[PDB]
């Protein structure tokens, strides 16, 4: 299989922003804990396959997320803290999360 493969390749698919409005999309510096934290990297996936499917145009990304969820480690395999928050469906929102979120996840899931 390459599940590696199938996180840094949708870091491709994240980067188009179109122009700066004023939507709540975005994560605020409590959720940025969340996203980092490997134990709790996989229910941020819970949240992100119930927001791509409100995320026009991120169907196939719910195909990764979703099958990536159990390609992640579990240091102490328990939660600890609310997990992410996804918005109405922007990939702005995703923009700061998803890219954040998918790039920690392989960057611990190897290390050296």
Not at 1 to 17: T, V, W, Y
Not at 39 to 52: C, D, G, I, K, Q
Request: aromatic share 4%.
């Amino acid at each position: 299989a390459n599940c590696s493969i199938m996180i840094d390749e949708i870091i491709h698919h994240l980067k188009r922003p179109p122009n700066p409005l004023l939507d709540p999309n975005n994560l605020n510096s409590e959720d940025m804990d969340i996203l980092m934290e490997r134990n709790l990297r996989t229910p941020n996936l819970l949240a992100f396959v119930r927001a791509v499917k409100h995320l026009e145009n991120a169907s196939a990304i719910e195909s990764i997320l979703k099958n990536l969820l159990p390609c992640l480690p579990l240091a102490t395999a328990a939660p600890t803290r609310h997990p992410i928050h996804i918005k109405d469906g922007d990939w702005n929102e995703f923009r700061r999360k998803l890219t954040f979120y998918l790039k920690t996840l392989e960057n611990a899931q190897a290390q050296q």
